[PDB]
Amino acid sequence: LAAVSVDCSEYPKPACPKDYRPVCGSDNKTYSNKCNFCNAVVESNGTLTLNHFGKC
Amino acid sequence: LAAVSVDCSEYPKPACPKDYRPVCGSDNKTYSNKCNFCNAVVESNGTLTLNHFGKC
Amino acid sequence: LAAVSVDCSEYPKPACPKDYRPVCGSDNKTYSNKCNFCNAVVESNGTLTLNHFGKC
Amino acid sequence: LAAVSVDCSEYPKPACPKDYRPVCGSDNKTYSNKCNFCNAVVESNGTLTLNHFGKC
Numbered sequence: 001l002a003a004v005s006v007d008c009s010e011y012p013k014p015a016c017p018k019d020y021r022p023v024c025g026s027d028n029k030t031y032s033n034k035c036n037f038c039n040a041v042v043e044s045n046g047t048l049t050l051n052h053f054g055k056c
Numbered sequence: 057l058a059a060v061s062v063d064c065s066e067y068p069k070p071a072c073p074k075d076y077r078p079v080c081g082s083d084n085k086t087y088s089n090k091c092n093f094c095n096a097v098v099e100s101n102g103t104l105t106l107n108h109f110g111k112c
Numbered sequence: 113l114a115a116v117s118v119d120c121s122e123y124p125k126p127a128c129p130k131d132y133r134p135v136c137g138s139d140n141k142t143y144s145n146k147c148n149f150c151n152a153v154v155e156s157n158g159t160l161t162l163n164h165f166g167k168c
Numbered sequence: 169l170a171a172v173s174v175d176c177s178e179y180p181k182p183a184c185p186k187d188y189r190p191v192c193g194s195d196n197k198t199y200s201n202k203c204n205f206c207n208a209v210v211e212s213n214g215t216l217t218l219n220h221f222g223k224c
Contacts, residue, residue, distance in 0.1 A: 001217065002106040003113040004097055005061040005173055008165050009133070009146045021068060024101070034065040038165075041116060046136070046164035049169065050114045052102035053064055053094075057161060057171040058218045060209060061117060077177070080214070090177045105113060108214035109176050109206075117173040120221055121202040124189060150221075153172055157192070158220035162170040 006050055011038035024056035025049070062106050064094035080112035081105070118162050120150035136168035137161070174218055179206035192224035193217070 006023070016035035023037040024030050026049040031037035041048050062079065072091035079093040080086055082105045087093035097104045118135065128147035135149040136142055138161045143149035153160045174191070184203035191205040192198050194217040199205035209216050 001057060001059045001113065001171075002108060003059040003061045003115040003117070003169075003171060003173065004064050004094075004105050005059070005115045005117040005171065006065040007063060007117055007119055009118055009135075011165070021066065021098075023065070042165040044164075045166050045168075050116050052114045053067065053098040054101040056101075057115070057169065058158075058220045059113070059115060059117065059171040059173045060218050061115065061171070061173040061175055062177055063119075063175055079177075102114075108212075109179070109210040110213050112213075113169060115169045115171040115173070117171045119175060120172050121174040121191070122189065123221065150172075154189075154221040157222040157224075161172050164170060 004053065006034060006038070008038035008041050011035070012042050013039065022055045023053055024051040026051045028056050030056040060106075060109075062090055062094065064097050067091075067094040067098045069095060078111040079109055080107040082107045084112050086112040116162075116165075118146055118150065120153050123150040123154045125151060134167040135165055136163040138163045140168050142168040172221065174202060174206070176206035176209050179203070180210050181207065190223045191221055192219040194219045196224050198224040
């Protein structure tokens, strides 16, 4: 199986970059970057995942 | 799941290297490197993913 | 496919850090960090995978 | 979707480390490490993938 992926291991991080590189989460919300996405993933305890890269 | 993946989480980027090290997209197009591929994935909003590494 | 993943390709390792930054395995056990988790995945021969990031 | 993954982007590499960190390929062969696995993946043009980490 081949995928396109995000590694959220280094997260959470108390501060994130202000770089806009959007990720669409499975909550159908668009996270401004990987760092916001991943902070949210880890805190979601299982319930938030990746839908696709880019704006929803 | 165990997968073979490309990490596109730091994309898009302002420019890519000219380095040849192809990736075959799910569109059966060969992308000259990972960077060119991931810049395309993040614009495809969901529709482009990895097919395999190396030229199609 | 778009996934959320942990890269375990450089595992097993001789030792892991004591750093707390939990990962929940598909066995519903919480692994104190990515390194402890991946050392377990590579011994599980197929049966253990990621459930989610953070504590179970 | 949550996975455990390998990134084979930096490959092929003409030489590999002699570190023994086995990967089982979907050809049901066991590759001595990530570098041997990935060299083989890229040359396989699509036909070789990950089965699981560790010896087959």
